[PDB]
Amino acid sequence: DRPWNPPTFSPALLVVTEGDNATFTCSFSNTSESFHVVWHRESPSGQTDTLAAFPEDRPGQDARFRVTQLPNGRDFHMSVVRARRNDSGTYVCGVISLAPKIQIKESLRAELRVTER
Amino acid sequence: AFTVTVPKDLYVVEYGSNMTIECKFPVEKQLDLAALIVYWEMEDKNIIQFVHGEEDLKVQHSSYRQRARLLKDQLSLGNAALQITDVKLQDAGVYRCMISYGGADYKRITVKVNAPYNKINQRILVVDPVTSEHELTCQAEGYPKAEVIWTSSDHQVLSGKTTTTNSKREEKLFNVTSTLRINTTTNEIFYCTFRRLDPEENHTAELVIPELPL
Ligand SMILES: [Cl-]
Secondary structure, eight states, rough: OOOOOOOEEEEEEEEEBTTTTTEEEEEOOOOSSEEEEEEEEGGGGEEEEEEEEESSOOOOOOEEEEEOOOOOOSSSEEEEEEEEGGEEEEEEEEEEOOOSEEEEEEEOOOOEEEEEO | OOOBOSSOSSEETTTSSSSSEEEEEOOOOSSOOOOOOOEEEEEEEEEEEEETTTEESOOOOOGGGTTTHHHHHHTTTTTEEEEESSGGGGGOOEEEEEESSEEEEEOOOOOOEEEOSSOEEEEEEEOOOTTTTEEEEEEEESSSSEEEEEETTTTEEEEEEEEEESSSSTTTOOOEEEEEEOOOOOOEEEEEEEEEESOOOOOOOOOOOOOOOO
16 A cells, blocks of 8 residues: 655656657656556647557567666666657656556656757 | 557537547457456546456445446457446546556546536516516526526616525536516517636736836
8 A cells, every 4th residue: 555656757858959869767666566667748639649668569669769677677768769850749658557556657748859950 | 569549539528418438459369358457547536447357346436336337348349438427527537548458558538528507497477467577587507607698589688686506416516596577568588698607717817016117
């Protein structure tokens, strides 16, 4: 029954130039034996796009988006290889607990700005 | 990776009616109920918990006791459809579905509930037959607060007495009753119009008085 806090999606504003790579950080404290962490892109008109998740199944993803776990097991990196100008917008990460109890918590929105070269 | 998709991010439902919101998830073969998990919630309240091919009702919120259910038939086709009967204002808000089936994902569905003043009850009483004075009453329920405009067939603006109270039947609903006392002749027509307020949050600006210039 031990309560835990919603994930943090840093930085709140990530600014990279197109061609380079951008990496977010999703951090939280896991009290779960079975859990998933997902990466969403929230655009206007209400469309939520699922980019990557952990653990990776293969499921067919864009491959420019991948979610990898750091050794400490509490921090996760949401990376984008060769960021496009169309990759700008708001992004969020969420965590899914299945084992202790079924609960879901989502991080705050983080703006990604892709500047021209 | 595993992605849950939603056809309609927004539902507008009429008050008192039934709504069915859907969440889609990949199914390439026979549905394996043992590995399937379906979760529905709204404002941190558990609505539907479907695990190990069976619905777990122990954690379900009291507000949805015998009015919410998951359509089993649609699951095999890869459709998680939540059906809620007798929709109230408290059901208006942001819903979230979670699906676990060889992977896990969740999506968000906005549900709006419209409670119009469309059920209008009326009454006509003769106060004094000598002076032909009549008393007209209109009443209806809805949200938010509504004002009543009385007009003649001439469309002239008339002033009546309006009383607005909380509905006894359902919470957060306003019971609006208006009464007009007027002298009139037979078969003349009167209209009571329920003007409602914006069902969306109002916008406010803060103004701070600055120093007096030289
Ligand atoms: Cl990959």
